[PDB]
Amino acid sequence: ALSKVKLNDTLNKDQLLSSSKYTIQRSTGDSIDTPNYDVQKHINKLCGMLLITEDANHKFTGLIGMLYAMSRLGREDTIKILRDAGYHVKANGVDVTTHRQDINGKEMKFEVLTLASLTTEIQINIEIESRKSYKKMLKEMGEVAPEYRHDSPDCGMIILCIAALVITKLAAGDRSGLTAVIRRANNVLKNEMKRYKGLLPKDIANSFYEVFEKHPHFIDVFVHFGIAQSSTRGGSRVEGIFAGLFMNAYGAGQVMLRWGVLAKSVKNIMLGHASVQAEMEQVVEVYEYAQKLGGEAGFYHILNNPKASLLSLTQFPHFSSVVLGNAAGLGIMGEYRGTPRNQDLYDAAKAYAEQLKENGVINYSVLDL
Amino acid sequence: ALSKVKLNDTLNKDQLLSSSKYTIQRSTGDSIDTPNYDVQKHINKLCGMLLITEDANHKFTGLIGMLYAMSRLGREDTIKILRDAGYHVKANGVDVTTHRQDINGKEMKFEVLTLASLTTEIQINIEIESRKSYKKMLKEMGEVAPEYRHDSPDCGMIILCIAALVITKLAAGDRSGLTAVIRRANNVLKNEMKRYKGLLPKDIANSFYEVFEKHPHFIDVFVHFGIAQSSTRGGSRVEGIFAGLFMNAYGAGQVMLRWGVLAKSVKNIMLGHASVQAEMEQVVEVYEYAQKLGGEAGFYHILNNPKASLLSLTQFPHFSSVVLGNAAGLGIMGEYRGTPRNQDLYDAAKAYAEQLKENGVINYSVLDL
Amino acid sequence: HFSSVVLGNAAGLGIMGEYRGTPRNQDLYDAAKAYAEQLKENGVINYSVLDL
Amino acid sequence: ALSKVKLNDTLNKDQLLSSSKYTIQRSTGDSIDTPNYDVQKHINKLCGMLLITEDANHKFTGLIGMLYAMSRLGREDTIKILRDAGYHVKANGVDVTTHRQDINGKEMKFEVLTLASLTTEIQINIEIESRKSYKKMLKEMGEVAPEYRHDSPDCGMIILCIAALVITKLAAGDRSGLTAVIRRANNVLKNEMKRYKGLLPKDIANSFYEVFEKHPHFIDVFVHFGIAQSSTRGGSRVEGIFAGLFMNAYGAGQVMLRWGVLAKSVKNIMLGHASVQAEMEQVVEVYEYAQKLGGEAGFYHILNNPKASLLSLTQFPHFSSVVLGNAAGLGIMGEYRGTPRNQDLYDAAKAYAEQLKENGVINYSVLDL
RNA sequence: CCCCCCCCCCCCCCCCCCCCCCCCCCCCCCCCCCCCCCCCCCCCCCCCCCCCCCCCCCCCCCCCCCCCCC
């Protein structure tokens, strides 16, 4: 029977990758600092001092946000995440200590952290800039409120909201989503961009881009922190904003699956073409694979999971071209920089999707009605 | 088959969030006072003294109501709630002690509580104001009744009724439901607003708004206290009022689901439009998700649960516009400040819902009858 | 009632012109006119309601 | 039942027009010459003399061709045709006689016809021109053949072939098909355009246009002559050419019916639009009417039959626009000067018909396959 | 009002048939017994009963139709 001349390549590749009986273990290189719940207050203080500092220097904001996320997770869970990701990690204990230095010819008390990645001078200078900006702004408006201070419990979570936007745009492969990050961080968080002098979305976004590029394990740590944070029973409104912006990253890098479901929903006719119907077997194969994967598959492209390539639909040029055409016809493709590889099917689907709005729907009374 | 080109994104996101294998643990900052059953009588006395004090100062009423709720729960359950919500809490023991001070040049006996959040001066001044207001009102009417006193066992529960109204309106994101809280606290509790001189709904509502804004964990504590209180076998009539007002908050922030069920019930025709039928698959997805969640989902938006965004229907502009139009046509939309994002479907549904009252119903004898 | 519905449908489709006959059920006339107008922006209405 | 709210206007109009119990009888004005079989040879001689005359004057060729057709029919059938068409006719007997005149100072014998419409001078001058052209061409090539002479039995039938082309293009309402007539008379009849010096398609076509414009009863006579000629058991090859060119006129003025059948055959999707399906009832009404009419309906527009307007499809703007779009997309519309009255449906159908050639066909596996 | 475009057709190859073959052939008359049929008893019917009985005229309002475009 010709019906059994078939090969389930996607499922077989998945079974090969999921049934490996040997494991690799990478070496991060530089030692990882693992803060615990103890220093969460101090890291939040540092984030607040960065936020209240106008004309601020955000060169180190990405690392400080990563430290805050790791302190929220805790040392045990951070270590367990790093092992489960397949890393050899030098767990570095983080504890708070005092440092005494004379600036302006006056003895001064600073409370800093033992971070191998972040030197004492940097934290001291962050405090100095924050203090003098606070002095100037207190002079210019008289009395402060808990709104204008580093002691707010959500100062770190605003920075992590910026990180969540960066994560949403990470799947583009470079810093091309920086403009989108800035635009969305101006739409969202506009009250904060009033309230905090140093909340500069572009600088923080660039810092997080840099830290994610240099340390790929921080992407894994941040994704699992975001999943753990989104699994809480509740929280403040800033944590709700972070959860909403983080789940905006679910399915990033897999827009074609959603647009294919959309093209099925609007019932585009060019799904009835000969070549599309030729590829439909493996297309349904891919969709069933995505469903069997389920929730974990939504962050494959952000995490650079090796099995991300199994979810691709560009390996079916005709179906992909029809899907892109339908997306462009419905007016939702935007600046999507993926290009069709069957221009004719793309144009036909685009035209039909455009007439799907002036000419509402097409019946199929043809053929017996 | 084109029927298997589908993705269950809502369910996959829920499974991802519910199957997390790492947890975060937040730090509240300031220490939490955890009163036990021992001081419930004294906290109720404090609430009664606040209530019988005319022209009262309600700056601290929200914290005192929170303390009363936590004393009703007990220290064990309050601590367990705070852990289950994912908080690091400094459990502060609350016990009663005496303080002696000379006011009016006379030695005076006061019995106060060891609360870190509430200083002794504040409790002393509350007692002073209550005592002199009691003296003045006793002078002006001769003899008091158990109706006019702080020893009533429901004085704290009236304050918690005001808190329940504030909770009902918390999902609006700000203090825009203050007018509704005042109106409902005048409709309900009018006998009390006679009986108690200091029962000022606006001041207590503002105090509870402030305490819920500053301490997001108090929202969790109060919601679980309200659930535990509503699980009792019975109580007084004020506790019944509190239970009725608290379950008025169930489903807050999710009005569109109820209005969609309503639009299905009145059988609005614009549910048969092309785009609405395109979105119906994911709409049924969302409704099945809400049902699988069940009872716990009714307080997701009040608690700022991260999975609250999964219940949204505004991600389907056409269905949402039809639902808003049907609600506006039936005359129940009120001042709902959500706006349609398909004006045409909104207007069509509104018009049909309006003719659903003069022109009772429409048969579908068209097509074969 | 039927005449009013018919006039409303004619006016909604934009073909009634200066037809000087007038409806004697204004409500049905207006309802039919409105539905006929939405029959052009909102192409057709399915009846998936009731078992589909 | 709403299914019986229907009116069969086309069929009712046809029954009204076909069941009239009173008849009109028009008056042609000028007397009609009715030649019989006797003078067929002489009229064919006259046509041959016109054909062999180079640089000829074809002012009277249309009338001579009409006389030849009427002589082929016979006087009885010509009279019966004129009565059945509803005309009052002065039947004029045509017989041959001799006329003697002196040209070049020499007595000369001419044999002419008693035609009221055609004077003796005209026939004499036709003979003179033919004779001297024959003399010149005999001088220039030495000896003639039966190919180069007026005695050929098909000289009149070539002129009637030109008349048949003019009839094919008569439905355009004016002399706009003159270029098409000339082009087709050059493609066909090229051997004759060699063989006959005076076979000028444009002059003969203009003469036939003039005679058909002045005498509308000659259109009826010629159409019924062409039907009678095409009902013969056989004939020469020129008569076969005439029959082929005459049946090319069948269905002239009714191209939209054929193009609608074509759009049904290629299964254009825009036949499933809402408005097209609204009009399909009366469209099928018109097609059933055309079939009930049958063969006689193919010459309604040429004859200006009053019931020609009942076969129109432009009374259904959406279906007509779809049909024109399908015709233009398939590349067969040419210079058809009818214009769509729904531009959107026209463009949509044109686009789909164009993709019907690169994208062969579209399956309807959508909806359950 | 309607209509409006393009378009002659044809074109090759090809007689068919061809063999063998008379059919039949035997045996065989059919029938054969026994047997008339019927047979009893029995007229049928039988009573009671005329039918009907009331109430009730009917009706009553409003309303020309049409109107466009082609």
**Complete DSSP assignment for C5-36:** HHHHHHHHTT--TT-----S-HHHHHHHHHHH
Size of interface B-C (CB pairs under 8 A): 38
CA–CA gap between residue D82 and residue D33 (Å, rounded): 12
Nearest CB among B2, B365, B366 relative to D365 is that of B2
- Diameter of chain A measured on Cα atoms: 96
Q: Which helix (H) or strand (E) holds A83?
A: helix A75-84
CB contact under 8 A, C44 and A361: yes
- D39 and D71 Cβ atoms separated by less than 8 Å: yes
The two structure tokens encoding residue B161: 């009724």
- B18 and B306 Cβ atoms separated by less than 8 Å: no
Backbone angles phi and psi of D61, in degrees to 5: -70, -35
Residue with tokens 């207590």: B204
CA–CA gap between residue B95 and residue A52 (Å, rounded): 39
How many Cβ atoms are within 10 Å of B298's Cβ, its own excluded? 17
Q: Which helix (H) or strand (E) holds A14?
A: helix A9-18
Buried residues in B21-56 as b, exposed as e (16+ CB within 10 A): ebebbbbbbeebbbbbeebbebbbbbbbbbbbbbeb
Three-state SS string over chain B comes to CHHHCCCCHHHHHHHHHHCCCCCCCEECCCCEEECCHHHHHHHHHHHHHHHHCCCCCCCCHHHHHHHHHHHHHCHHHHHHHHHHCCEECCEEECCEEEEEEEECCEEEEEEEECCCCCCHHHHHHHHHHHHHHHHHHHHHHCCCCCCCCCCCCCHHHHHHHHHHHHHHHHHHCCCCCHHHHHHHHHHCCHHHHHHCCCCCHHHHHHHHHHHHHHCHHHHHHHHHHHHHHHCCCCCCHHHHHHHHHHHCCCCCCCHHHHHHHHHHHCCCHHHHCHHHHHHHHHHHHHHHHHHHHHHHHHHCCCCCCHHHHHHCCCCCHHHHHHHHHHHHHCCCCCCCCCCCCCHHHHHHHHHHHHHHHHCCCCCCCCCCC
Sequence letter at residue A60: F
Question: Measured between alpha carbons, how far is residue A342 from residues A70, A276, A322 in Å?
Answer: 47, 11, 8
Angle, vertex CA D306, rays to CA D305 and CA D311, nearest 5: 85
The two structure tokens encoding residue D304: 């200006």
Contacts of residue A270, Cβ cutoff 8 Å, sequence gap at least 6: A276, A322, A325, A326, A345, A348, A349, A352, D359, D362
D141-CA/E44-C1' distance, Å: 135
Q: In strand E, which positions have an atom below 7 A from any protein CB?
A: 1-9, 66-69
- The tally of CA atoms less than 13 A away on the side-chain side of residue C11 is 20
Considering only CB atoms, which chain C residues are within 8 Å of A359? 43
Burial class (CB in 10 A: 0-12, 13-18, 19+), B304: buried
Q: Which SS3 state, helix, strand or coil, does residue D291 take?
A: helix
CA–CA gap between residue D112 and residue D96 (Å, rounded): 6
Q: Residue B10 CA to chain centroid, in angstroms?
A: 26
Q: Which SS3 state, helix, strand or coil, does residue D243 take?
A: helix
Residue with tokens 């702004």: A137
Task: Search chain A and give the residue with CA nearest B173.
Answer: A237
Asked whether residue C43, judged by its CB, lies under 7 Å from any atom of the DNA or RNA strand E, the reply is no
Sequence letter at residue B259: W
CA–CA gap between residue D45 and residue A34 (Å, rounded): 119
Considering only CB atoms, which chain A residues are within 8 Å of B19? 295
Q: Which of B337, D348, B260, B262 is nearest to A360 (CA)?
A: D348
The two structure tokens encoding residue B222: 């109060």
CA–CA gap between residue A279 and residue D273 (Å, rounded): 29
CA–CA gap between residue B64 and residue B6 (Å, rounded): 53
Contacts of residue B46, Cβ cutoff 8 Å, sequence gap at least 6: B64, B123, B126, B150
Sequence letter at residue A145: A
Mutate which: A347, A352, A368, A369, vs D, most D CBs within 10 A: A352
D315-CA/E70-C1' distance, Å: 9
The two structure tokens encoding residue D34: 């009715």
Task: Search chain C and give the residue with CA nearest B269.
Answer: C45
Q: Which of B35, B23, B24, B29 is nearest to B221 (CA)?
A: B35
Residue D357 Cα, gap to closest chain B Cα (Å): 25
Asked whether residue D262, judged by its CB, lies under 7 Å from any atom of the DNA or RNA strand E, the reply is no
- The tally of CA atoms less than 13 A away on the side-chain side of residue C18 is 0
Asked whether residue D88, judged by its CB, lies under 7 Å from any atom of the DNA or RNA strand E, the reply is no
Considering only CB atoms, which chain B residues are within 8 Å of C27? 355, 358-359
Question: Measured between alpha carbons, how far is residue D304 from residues A143, D152, D176, D297 in Å?
Answer: 98, 35, 17, 11
Helix axes D255-265, D274-293, angle to 10 degrees: 120
Q: Which residues pair with D113 in a beta bridge?
A: D96
Q: Which helix (H) or strand (E) holds A110?
A: strand A106-113
Buried residues in A198-235 as b, exposed as e (16+ CB within 10 A): bbbbebbbbbbbebbeebebbbbbbbbbbbbbbbbbbb
Sequence letter at residue B277: Q
Q: Is beta strand A87-88 parallel, antiparallel or unpaired with respect to B96-103? A: unpaired
Residue D8 Cα, gap to closest chain B Cα (Å): 20
The residue whose CA lies nearest the C1' of nucleotide E67 is: C20
- D73 and D208 Cβ atoms separated by less than 8 Å: no
The two structure tokens encoding residue B193: 């607003």
Helix axes C2-12, C26-41, angle to 10 degrees: 40
CA–CA gap between residue D190 and residue D184 (Å, rounded): 10
C14-CA/E49-C1' distance, Å: 86
Q: Which residues pair with D34 in a beta bridge?
A: D93
Residue B326 Cα, gap to closest chain C Cα (Å): 15
Q: Which SS3 state, helix, strand or coil, does residue A4 take?
A: helix
**Experimental technique used to determine this entry:** cryo-EM
Q: Which residues pair with B88 in a beta bridge?
A: B27
How many Cβ atoms are within 10 Å of D59's Cβ, its own excluded? 12
Asked whether residue D37, judged by its CB, lies under 7 Å from any atom of the DNA or RNA strand E, the reply is no
Q: Work out whether the CA dihedral A319, A322, A326, A327 comes out positive or negative.
A: positive
CA–CA gap between residue B144 and residue B153 (Å, rounded): 16
Asked whether residue D184, judged by its CB, lies under 7 Å from any atom of the DNA or RNA strand E, the reply is yes
- D181 and D165 Cβ atoms separated by less than 8 Å: yes
CB contact under 8 A, C42 and B345: yes
Q: Which of B367, B358, B257 is nearest to B315 (CA)?
A: B257
Three-state SS string over A267-282 comes to CCHHHHCHHHHHHHHH
Q: Which residues pair with D111 in a beta bridge?
A: D98
Q: Which of D217, D235, D284 is nearest to D66 (CA)?
A: D217
Helices and strands (H and E) in chain A: how many: 15, 6
Structure resolution, Å: 2.8
- B58 and B139 Cβ atoms separated by less than 8 Å: no
- The tally of CA atoms less than 13 A away on the side-chain side of residue B32 is 26
Asked whether residue D356, judged by its CB, lies under 7 Å from any atom of the DNA or RNA strand E, the reply is no
Q: Which of B135, B134, B240 is nearest to B188 (CA)?
A: B240
Helices within A170-273 (DSSP H only): 178-187, 190-195, 201-214, 216-230, 237-247, 255-265
Q: Work out whether the CA dihedral B296, B302, B307, B313 comes out positive or negative.
A: positive
Backbone angles phi and psi of A193, in degrees to 5: -65, -25
Considering only CB atoms, which chain B residues are within 8 Å of D366? 2
Q: Which of B281, B115, B302 is nearest to B226 (CA)?
A: B302
How many Cβ atoms are within 10 Å of A328's Cβ, its own excluded? 20
Contacts of residue A292, Cβ cutoff 8 Å, sequence gap at least 6: none
Residue C48 contacts A where some CB pair is shorter than 8 Å? no
The two structure tokens encoding residue B138: 């006793």
CB contact under 8 A, C42 and A360: yes
- D218 and D136 Cβ atoms separated by less than 8 Å: no
Residue B358 contacts C where some CB pair is shorter than 8 Å? yes
CA–CA gap between residue B349 and residue B240 (Å, rounded): 39
Residue C42 Cα, gap to closest chain A Cα (Å): 7
Helices within chain D (DSSP H only): 9-18, 40-52, 61-73, 75-84, 120-141, 155-169, 178-187, 190-195, 201-214, 216-230, 237-247, 255-265, 274-293, 317-329, 343-358
The two structure tokens encoding residue B336: 């709902």
Q: Work out whether the CA dihedral A195, A197, A201, A204 comes out positive or negative.
A: negative
Sequence letter at residue D303: L
Fill in the DSSP letter of residue D1. Answer: -
Angle, vertex CA D69, rays to CA D67 and CA D72, nearest 5: 110
Q: Which residues, numbered 293 to 352 in chain D, qualify as contacts with chain A under a Cβ-Cβ cut-off of 8 Å? A: 344-345, 348, 351
Residue with tokens 């995490």: A303
Q: Which residues, numbered 261 to 280 in chain B, qualify as contacts with chain C under a Cβ-Cβ cut-off of 8 Å? A: 267, 269-274, 277
Considering only CB atoms, which chain B residues are within 8 Å of A224? 20, 22
Residue with tokens 């399908």: D326
Q: Which of B59, B123, B57 is nearest to B94 (CA)?
A: B123
